């Protein structure tokens, strides 16, 4: 009966990297936005839709590092935006900020969405530290003006990154990993929603745990063998990548996905490690799904919030 409709918007340079490595890895389901103020880069995105900003301000260039020239390329074409936005009933909006487009033109795009009634969700990152300390008070503005904007907020340090690389590993291999914390909560609320359970969530539930609410964790965890609901669910809630660990989570949402083998007890454990990681009491939405497809594999998602 209801058709959830989820898109995905790239906002700047690094928002439309990861849009483009996504396209490429393959999503489905899901509609791409690209939005720039770099013609150069727009001509190279997969995106279906695209939209320039700021054409007589930059003249096609970007913002040079300016964020007051993203915000008002954004402004100037909200209605460009609105456009390609109606109709979606959750937005995820994504960019790197530090610079210019994506630190001021973001939180344009995501007051917009929020304004045309998407439940809308900031995955954005920090930059390395290696950057400066002007290019990270800069984008650490852009991310209090994300907060103020979106539903729900997933910030990724890029200084993370530097703790699961070793000497050699390539940096566009580092991005990719990134880009998982976008790509598979998108997944995994296609997946919910496109799905019926035995204990069913929905995207109302959904709506329900990411209005209005600040900080987000979104983790995906996927295990065998013995132990294997613990093992997924530590896994969904610890990744090295992300600045809101599960710790301090007063609302989870869980779903829990296995074969005809899925059993109560292991369920619990499960729903265990989150509420004890979070060290709080924790108003669970539960969900399970039985996909017999799958054997011995049991795939954990949480989304954390009430920070
Ligand atoms: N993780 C990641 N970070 C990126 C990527 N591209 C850019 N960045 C970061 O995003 C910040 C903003 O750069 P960019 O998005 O290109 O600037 P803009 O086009 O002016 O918004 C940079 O300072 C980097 O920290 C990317 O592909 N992956
Ligand atoms: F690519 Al920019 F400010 F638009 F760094
Ligand atoms: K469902
Ligand atoms: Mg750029």
New binding site residues.
């Given amino acids: 009966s209801h058709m959830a409709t989820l898109k995905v918007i790239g906002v700047?340079?690094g928002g439309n990297n990861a849009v483009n490595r996504m396209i490429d890895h393959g999503m489905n389901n899901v509609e791409f936005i690209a939005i720039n103020?770099?013609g150069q880069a727009l001509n190279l995105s997969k995106a279906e839709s695209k939209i320039q900003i700021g054409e007589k301000l930059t003249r096609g260039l970007?913002?040079?590092?300016?964020p007051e020239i993203?915000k008002k390329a954004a402004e100037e074409s909200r209605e460009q935006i609105e456009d390609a936005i109606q109709g979606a009933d959750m937005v995820f909006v994504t960019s790197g900020m530090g610079?210019?487009?994506g630190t001021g033109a973001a939180p344009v795009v995501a007051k917009i969405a929020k304004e045309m009634g998407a439940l809308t969700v900031g995955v954005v990152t920090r930059p390395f530290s290696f950057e400066g300390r002007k290019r990270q008070t800069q984008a650490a503005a852009g991310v209090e003006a994300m907060k103020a904007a979106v539903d729900t907020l997933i910030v990724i340090p890029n200084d993370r990154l530097l703790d699961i690389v070793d000497k050699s590993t390539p940096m566009m291999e580092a991005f990719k990993e990134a880009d998982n914390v976008l790509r598979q909560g998108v997944q995994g609320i296609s997946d919910l929603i496109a799905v019926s359970g035995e204990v069913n969530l929905d995207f109302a539930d959904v709506k329900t745990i990411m209005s209005n609410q600040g900080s987000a964790l979104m983790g995906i965890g996927v295990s065998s063998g013995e132990n294997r609901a613990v093992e997924a669910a530590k896994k969904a809630i610890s990744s090295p990548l992300l600045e809101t660990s599960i710790v301090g989570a007063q609302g989870v949402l869980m779903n829990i996905t296995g074969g005809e083998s899925l059993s109560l007890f292991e369920a619990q454990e499960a729903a265990d490690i989150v509420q004890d990681a979070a060290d709080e009491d924790v108003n669970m939405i539960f969900g399970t799904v039985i996909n017999p497809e799958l054997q011995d594999e049991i795939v954990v998602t949480v989304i954390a919030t009430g920070f």
């Fill in positions: 700047g340079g103020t770099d970007g913002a040079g590092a300016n993203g610079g210019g487009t």
